[PDB]
Enzyme design. Structure first.
Site, PDB file in Angstrom:
ATOM      1  N   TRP A  50     -49.757 -12.893  27.468  1.00 22.26           N
ATOM      2  CA  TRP A  50     -49.037 -11.658  27.800  1.00 22.26           C
ATOM      3  C   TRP A  50     -47.916 -12.077  28.748  1.00 22.26           C
ATOM      4  O   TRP A  50     -48.178 -12.660  29.793  1.00 22.26           O
ATOM      5  CB  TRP A  50     -49.997 -10.691  28.499  1.00 22.26           C
ATOM      6  CG  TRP A  50     -49.392  -9.385  28.895  1.00 22.26           C
ATOM      7  CD1 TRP A  50     -48.641  -8.555  28.115  1.00 22.26           C
ATOM      8  CD2 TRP A  50     -49.531  -8.730  30.164  1.00 22.26           C
ATOM      9  NE1 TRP A  50     -48.284  -7.435  28.827  1.00 22.26           N
ATOM     10  CE2 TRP A  50     -48.813  -7.520  30.083  1.00 22.26           C
ATOM     11  CE3 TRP A  50     -50.183  -9.054  31.358  1.00 22.26           C
ATOM     12  CZ2 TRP A  50     -48.732  -6.635  31.154  1.00 22.26           C
ATOM     13  CZ3 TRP A  50     -50.101  -8.156  32.423  1.00 22.26           C
ATOM     14  CH2 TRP A  50     -49.380  -6.968  32.305  1.00 22.26           C
ATOM     15  N   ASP A  90     -58.680 -11.634  33.268  1.00 18.20           N
ATOM     16  CA  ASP A  90     -57.841 -10.470  32.973  1.00 18.20           C
ATOM     17  C   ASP A  90     -58.658  -9.715  31.918  1.00 18.20           C
ATOM     18  O   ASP A  90     -58.840 -10.212  30.804  1.00 18.20           O
ATOM     19  CB  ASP A  90     -56.479 -10.869  32.395  1.00 18.20           C
ATOM     20  CG  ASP A  90     -55.587  -9.667  32.134  1.00 18.20           C
ATOM     21  OD1 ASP A  90     -56.129  -8.564  31.934  1.00 18.20           O
ATOM     22  OD2 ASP A  90     -54.350  -9.829  32.104  1.00 18.20           O
ATOM     23  N   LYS A 145     -56.231   1.247  28.307  1.00 20.90           N
ATOM     24  CA  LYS A 145     -56.588   1.376  26.898  1.00 20.90           C
ATOM     25  C   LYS A 145     -57.947   1.994  26.631  1.00 20.90           C
ATOM     26  O   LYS A 145     -58.064   2.881  25.786  1.00 20.90           O
ATOM     27  CB  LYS A 145     -56.527   0.042  26.166  1.00 20.90           C
ATOM     28  CG  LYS A 145     -55.150  -0.454  25.913  1.00 20.90           C
ATOM     29  CD  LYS A 145     -54.565  -1.039  27.144  1.00 20.90           C
ATOM     30  CE  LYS A 145     -53.190  -1.582  26.860  1.00 20.90           C
ATOM     31  NZ  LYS A 145     -52.905  -2.603  27.898  1.00 20.90           N
TER      32      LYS A 145
HETATM   33  C1  LIG Z   1     -53.794  -8.859  28.731  1.00 18.84           C
HETATM   34  C2  LIG Z   1     -53.183  -7.684  29.500  1.00 18.84           C
HETATM   35  N1  LIG Z   1     -53.321  -7.628  30.837  1.00 18.84           N
HETATM   36  C3  LIG Z   1     -52.809  -6.585  31.532  1.00 18.84           C
HETATM   37  C4  LIG Z   1     -52.115  -5.582  30.873  1.00 18.84           C
HETATM   38  C5  LIG Z   1     -51.511  -4.453  31.720  1.00 18.84           C
HETATM   39  O1  LIG Z   1     -52.337  -3.334  31.711  1.00 18.84           O
HETATM   40  P1  LIG Z   1     -51.897  -2.036  32.627  1.00 18.84           P
HETATM   41  O2  LIG Z   1     -50.987  -1.152  31.804  1.00 18.84           O
HETATM   42  O3  LIG Z   1     -53.166  -1.328  33.007  1.00 18.84           O
HETATM   43  O4  LIG Z   1     -51.151  -2.534  33.834  1.00 18.84           O
HETATM   44  C6  LIG Z   1     -51.961  -5.622  29.519  1.00 18.84           C
HETATM   45  C7  LIG Z   1     -51.167  -4.544  28.745  1.00 18.84           C
HETATM   46  N2  LIG Z   1     -50.202  -5.106  27.790  1.00 18.84           N
HETATM   47  C8  LIG Z   1     -49.619  -4.167  26.816  1.00 18.84           C
HETATM   48  C9  LIG Z   1     -50.692  -3.381  26.092  1.00 18.84           C
HETATM   49  C10 LIG Z   1     -48.617  -3.209  27.473  1.00 18.84           C
HETATM   50  C11 LIG Z   1     -47.672  -3.975  28.409  1.00 18.84           C
HETATM   51  O5  LIG Z   1     -46.937  -4.912  27.970  1.00 18.84           O
HETATM   52  O6  LIG Z   1     -47.636  -3.673  29.635  1.00 18.84           O
HETATM   53  C12 LIG Z   1     -48.951  -4.931  25.676  1.00 18.84           C
HETATM   54  O7  LIG Z   1     -48.268  -4.303  24.826  1.00 18.84           O
HETATM   55  O8  LIG Z   1     -49.094  -6.173  25.559  1.00 18.84           O
HETATM   56  C13 LIG Z   1     -52.510  -6.678  28.838  1.00 18.84           C
HETATM   57  O9  LIG Z   1     -52.383  -6.751  27.468  1.00 18.84           O
END
Ligand SMILES: Cc1ncc(COP(=O)(O)O)c(CN[C@@](C)(CC(=O)O)C(=O)O)c1O
Ligand SMILES: Cc1ncc(COP(=O)(O)O)c(CN)c1O
Lengths: 414, 412
Positions: free
Chosen positions: B140, B222, B258
C-alpha cells in the site's frame, strides 16, 4: 532462565500534566463547597456540560437521513464545510473570497489545523525545508502551541511579551518591541480573540499598531481562532482582527476550531483557512497540504463537519445557532461582572477591572502561587498555579463563596 | 511589489487513488465502472451502510444522556479494549497478563502514524532514525509515506510477489528476513495483502516468525481487513495471535473502515503488546504526548458505534453476519470473473483471480493496458494491475471481462 529485556525497557514514564491531577483531587474532595475553576469547557449554571439545542436538532435530521453514506470524504474534507468555515471567519463580503484567493482544509479540531499549517511552513515557507525560521508565541500561551511547532521540526521557538503581571493587562510596549526586533519573515502565532489563558486581547486600535510592524518586516501572521462568537457573542466582532489583516493585504493562515462555539469538542471539527496574494497559489498550496494530510490521518471524519455545514448553510438553523452562542457568551459576561462586583464591594485590595476587561472563558486573575495554594488547600477552590480560572466554573450559587475566599487569599497571603 | 510567500510552492503530485474517485464522478460516459478505491459495493454499484451500523446510529441519536465533552487523549476506553480484544482474542495470554495497550486512532493510517512516530523516538535507542524499515514488494503506497514522514531514512523492501509464479515468493521473503540487520522493523499485512491479495499460509507464517524471532526483528502489523480474507474474524487474526503466543512484542495498527464500513468516521486502534505490564504504562504515557500534538484527542462517533457493537452479543452476532455477507459476495465474484474470461478465450491461464483473498486481486496487466481501459472504456483501476473485486456486479460483469479481453489481445 535466560530472558532478554523488552524493547521498551528503557522507555521513561512521561511527566504528568498538572491540570489532569488537579481534576482528580477535586473529584475526590468530599467538601460540599468545592469549586472547579480548572475545567476546560463550557458549563451551565448547574455545572453541567451543554449540548447546543441546534446541535441536537441537526443530529436528529442527520440520523433520519437515509441518503447519507460513510464513503471516504476527500483528503481536504467536506467541500461545503470548508467553504462555510472560511466564510464564517472572513465574512461573506471578504475581498479575498471574491478574488478567489482563499483555501480551506478540514482538520481535526483547531489542534489539527495548527499542525497541518506548521508542517506546511516547515517544508515550503521561507525557502525549502527551512526549520530555522523563528516562531513566536505569546508569553504566556496555550501549552500546545510550543508542542505543535516543535514537533513540526521548528528549532527556534521564541516568545513575545504579552501579559504584564504588574498592570494586569497587555504589555503593548514590550510586544511592539519584540515585533520590531523579530527577523524578517518570522512566524507569529496570534490569538484572534479570547486570548488563552489570559483573557486579555488587544483593542482594535492596538491591533492596528501590531499589524503595521508585521507589515513592514514581513512577519507572517498565523491566527489561532478557537473562540469565534463564543467569546463576545458577536461573530463579526470576534473576527475583526483577522478581517483587518486581510483588508491590509496580508497573506495568512487561520486555524479555526468549532469545539467551543458549537460545543463539538469530541467530534474534532476544525478548518485551516489560507489567504494568499494570488489565486493560482491556492491550488499549489492545497496540493501540498493534501500530501501532509494523507500521511497523518488520510482523510477527515464526517459527523462534526456535517453538523457545522448544515447549520451554517440553513438560515433558520444559523439564526438559532447565533442565539445559542450568545447564550454562552452572555453567561460568561455575567460571571465576570458579578465576580468583579463582589470583590469591589468587599473592598478587596488591588484593581479588578481586568476581570471585566478580559474576554472569554479564561481569566488571569493576577493571584500569586501562594494565594492559589491557599485557595486549594484551604477553601477547596481549584485553579492552576498561574492564577488562571475558567469563568464557567462560577455559578449564581457559588459566587459568594468564591469572592469571599479570594478576598481572604488576597488579604491574608503575601 | 511584495511577492507572495507562496510564490515558489510547486504543484504537488495528486494522490493517485484519491484521484480516480474524482475522475469517475465527473466522467460523463454512461458505461463507466470504478475498480479503483478499496471500498465495498453492492451488486448494484452502491455504497453499503451495514444494517447493524444503521441500528446503532439510531440508538446513539436517541440517547439524550450522551454529550460531546472531549474524550481522553488515548480515546474511548471501551473502544480501545474491545478493539484489542477483537484482534488478540478473548483468551489471549497477553490480555490476561495485562500487557496489552491500545491507542484510539484516526483510522488505520492514524494508527500507523502514531506507531511510527513512537518507534522513531524510543525504539532501538533514542531518536534513532536509522533503524531500517521494511515494507512488502509491492505494498500500500501510504506505507512508505507514513514512515518517511516519521523520519525513517532507510526504507527497504522485502520480496513478496512472484510475477511469474503469480504468488508468494516465500524464498525471497525469507532471504530478505535473514539478511536484515537485527532490530529492523517489518511492516506486515495481517491478512488480505494489499494489493496482491496473496497471504502466507499458517505454515509459511511460522517460518517467517522463526526468522524474526531469531534476528530480533520487530513485527509492525497492519490489520485493515480482519474479516475480508475469509469472512471469519477469528481466522483472519490467526497470524497476529500466533506471533503473540510465540512471545513477540509488537504493534498492530487496526482499521475499522472496511469491516464496519465506517470509512468516513476514521476509526482505528493501535494495539501494543509488551513482555510485561509496566512497559505498557510507560509506552502509553509517551503515545499521549504524540497524540496531543497531532489531533489532541480523537473523534467519538465512529468509536461509539464500534464499542457498542463489540460489547453487545446480539449486535456482535448481527455484525459478523454482515461481514460474512460482504466476503461472500467477493468470494462469488472471484469466480464469475474467472469463468467469463476463460470463456471469452482471453489468451492465458488466469487462475490467480480466484486463489487470492480480500477485496483486491493482482491480475497481470501491463501499465499500457490500464491506460487503454481507463481512457477508451472508462474502467478506472490502478496502473499496477490491481482491481477491486467489489467493483464487479452481475451487470457490468460482462462489459468488464470483455474490456480486459480486448486489451490483452489488441494492446499486447
Ligand atoms: C493495508 C492498508 N492499511 C491501511 C489502510 C488505511 O485505512 P484507513 O482508511 O482506516 O486509514 C488501507 C486502506 N487502503 C485503501 C482501501 C484506501 C486508501 O488508499 O487509503 C486502498 O484503496 O488501498 C490499507 O489497504
Ligand atoms: C487557543 C486555543 N487554540 C487551540 C485550541 C484547540 O482546540 P481543539 O480542541 O479544537 O483542537 C484551544 C482549545 N480550545 C485553544 O484554547
Amino acid at each position: 532462565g535466560m530472558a532478554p529485556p523488552s524493547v521498551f525497557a528503557e522507555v521513561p514514564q512521561a511527566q504528568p500534566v498538572l491540570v489532569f491531577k488537579l481534576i482528580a483531587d477535586f473529584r475526590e474532595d468530599p467538601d460540599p463547597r468545592k469549586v472547579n475553576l480548572g475545567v476546560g469547557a463550557y458549563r451551565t449554571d448547574d455545572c453541567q456540560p451543554w449540548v447546543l439545542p441546534v446541535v441536537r436538532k441537526v443530529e436528529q435530521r442527520i440520523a433520519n437521513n437515509s441518503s447519507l453514506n460513510h464513503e471516504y470524504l476527500p483528503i481536504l474534507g467536506l467541500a461545503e464545510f470548508r467553504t462555510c468555515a472560511s466564510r464564517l471567519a472572513l465574512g461573506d463580503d471578504s475581498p479575498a473570497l471574491q478574488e478567489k484567493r482563499v483555501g480551506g482544509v478540514q482538520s481535526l479540531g483547531g489542534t489539527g489545523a495548527l499542525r497541518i499549517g506548521a508542517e506546511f511552513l516547515a517544508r515550503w515557507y521561507n525557502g525549502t525545508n527551512n526549520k530555522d525560521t523563528p516562531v513566536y508565541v505569546s508569553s504566556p500561551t496555550w501549552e500546545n502551541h510550543n508542542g505543535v511547532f516543535t514537533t513540526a521540526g521548528f528549532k527556534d521557538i521564541r516568545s513575545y511579551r504579552y501579559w504584564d503581571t504588574e498592570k494586569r493587562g497587555l504589555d503593548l510596549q514590550g510586544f511592539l518591541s519584540d515585533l520590531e526586533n523579530a527577523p524578517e519573515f518570522s512566524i507569529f502565532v496570534l490569538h484572534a480573540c479570547a486570548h488563552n489563558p489570559t483573557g486579555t486581547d488587544p483593542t482594535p486600535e492596538q491591533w492596528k499598531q501590531i499589524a503595521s510592524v508585521m507589515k513592514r518586516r514581513f512577519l507572517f501572521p498565523f491566527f489561532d481562532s478557537a473562540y469565534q462568537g463564543f467569546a463576545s457573542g458577536n461573530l463579526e466582532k470576534d473576527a475583526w482582527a483577522i478581517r483587518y489583516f486581510v483588508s491590509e493585504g496580508f497573506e495568512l493562515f487561520c486555524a479555526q476550531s468549532f469545539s467551543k462555539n458549537f460545543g463539538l469538542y469530541n467530534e474534532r471539527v476544525g478548518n485551516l483557512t489560507v489567504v494568499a496574494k494570488e489565486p493560482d497559489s491556492i491550488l499549489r498550496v492545497l496540493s501540498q497540504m493534501q500530501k501532509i494530510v494523507r500521511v497523518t490521518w488520510s482523510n477527515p471524519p464526517a459527523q462534526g463537519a456535517r453538523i457545522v455545514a448544515r447549520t451554517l448553510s440553513d438560515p433558520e438553523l444559523f439564526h438559532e445557532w447565533t442565539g445559542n452562542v450568545k447564550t454562552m457568551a452572555d453567561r460568561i459576561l455575567s460571571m465576570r461582572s458579578e465576580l468583579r462586583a463582589r470583590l469591589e464591594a468587599l473592598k478587596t485590595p488591588g484593581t479588578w477591572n481586568h476581570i471585566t476587561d478580559q474576554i472569554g472563558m479564561f481569566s488571569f486573575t493576577g493571584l500569586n502561587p501562594k494565594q492559589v495554594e491557599y485557595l486549594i488547600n484551604q477553601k477547596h477552590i481549584y485553579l492552576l498555579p498561574s492564577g488562571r480560572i475558567n469563568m464557567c466554573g462560577l455559578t449564581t450559587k457559588n459566587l459568594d463563596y468564591v469572592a469571599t475566599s479570594i478576598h481572604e487569599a488576597v488579604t491574608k497571603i503575601q
